[model samples]
Target: NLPVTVAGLGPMGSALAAALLDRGHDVTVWNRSPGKAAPLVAKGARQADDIVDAVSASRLLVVCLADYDALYSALGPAREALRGRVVVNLNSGTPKEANEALRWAERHGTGYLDGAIMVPPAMVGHPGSVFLYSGSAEVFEEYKETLAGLGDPVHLGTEAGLAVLYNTALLSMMYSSMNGFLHAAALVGSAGVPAAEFTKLAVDWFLPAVIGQIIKAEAPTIDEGVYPGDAGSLEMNVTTLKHIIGTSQEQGVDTEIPVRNKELLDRAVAAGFGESSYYSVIELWR
Candidate 1:
């Protein structure tokens, strides 16, 4: 197998390098802190002296940085070395940033593929771990086996933005769920119920029922573009939400979460769809 070069030696960089070494690939690494690469070097990974040397050492460059800005800062000195190389960026950023990086790679005569690591550093080589990719399918296939050294690979489409979008959607979903849980915990905690106690019923029972909500919400969201109020209306939700906000106010917990949601519902109701299902508020997004 051909050698692979990895740039960035933070926790993610170290784990990536270690995974490559474990899989018997000659891994070359570079970082601002040479000392950070020491552990990987001791594990049989080659430590590149500079950015150019690091990029020149392999055809594939896997970058894991704080963001696209940091990736370019490191790439600054390796512009020429980037030519004819496949630059795989796993930094977290918007889809626009991913597309811009692809364009930059093209001008430099290099291939580009935007990627998002779904799992944490320690899960790098695990089977259940996911790594989302986008931009070029050809580049994905060319480096399939090598990329597998990191984690399970999933390609969304040709748009460089898809992977980041997926990553973003995943994060948003998690945050939305957690924020609601916090509010619920606060609501119950107001009555002297322990959060740990409520969370048991939450994860075990509440979430299963919530999944059905998505199924119900998605159909109208996709089909007629109009949400049916067969179950609940924004008018009804506004009343319940006010109760939630009132409880928070009484409990002295932060009211931002439900308050922000009420703002959306108020706008939707003002738009004359107060009778529509709560999901119909999605129109406000359009």
Candidate 2:
């Protein structure tokens, strides 16, 4: 039946267990607090009394704990049960943290796989949803169908840390895009434009047709190790940024976003990249 054991019962954890249950898999679920297991249990999931029972219940264990620390604390006493099993850690954590967990799994003789949920709980189980996974390629190949029940599973590589690394990179991109939208909203709202209405233009015509497409096409030249300045120079961007900062001040809006943006460009210019393209700022990341 490809029985699966899910540890942790937070919203995301609950969703994971439920997704499996919905797929007709024999699902065993456990939560540190116990109370959170009610919903899944009602959905035909068997609730484990403790971590040991949970680990023993299935050959494939999926952990969706708060972090690496939480997972260790819950499963520490049941380390032996992990032997000969595949443990997929879906916890949000740093790249190095996942690597550490991989070593821990190795010491206990368990197959380890790292996972990153790329969608919210509600979107899970959809055919188009993507879940990034790494480590134990053979283990992934063995359990691909079971994993695909939760989402469209994509194996990144054999490195246990790659999943979390990709997760953080995607998260960084998301936050930067959202925050840029917010700052633009503030700038436009000062001119009596409603954020809701302005967002229509942004989502409809602006982002898809211009900004998003250009950024993808204008991605920094990592191969050449240089960002082409043919599109627009840093000096030109800094000039416009100054106007954004000044306009924010004149319109009684917060200037932190623009000011911080200008500071980065200013530093880039000071480092002799004034004539370089906006994407060149990525060089400062290293």
Which candidate ranks first by lDDT, i.e. highest? 2
What is candidate 2's local distance difference test score? Answer: 0.88
Candidate 2, position 125, lDDT: 91
Residues 200-265 of candidate 1: C-alpha lDDT, one tens digit per residue: 899777787776566675775646877776777889999998998887898888899999999999
Clashes of 1: 0
True-vs-predicted CA distance for residue 8, candidate 2, Å: 1.1
For candidate 1, report its TM-score.
Answer: 0.86
TM-score of each: 0.86, 0.90
Clashing pairs in 1: none
Best by TM-score: 2
lDDT value, candidate 1, whole model:
0.85
In order, the Cα lDDT scores of the candidates are 0.85, 0.88
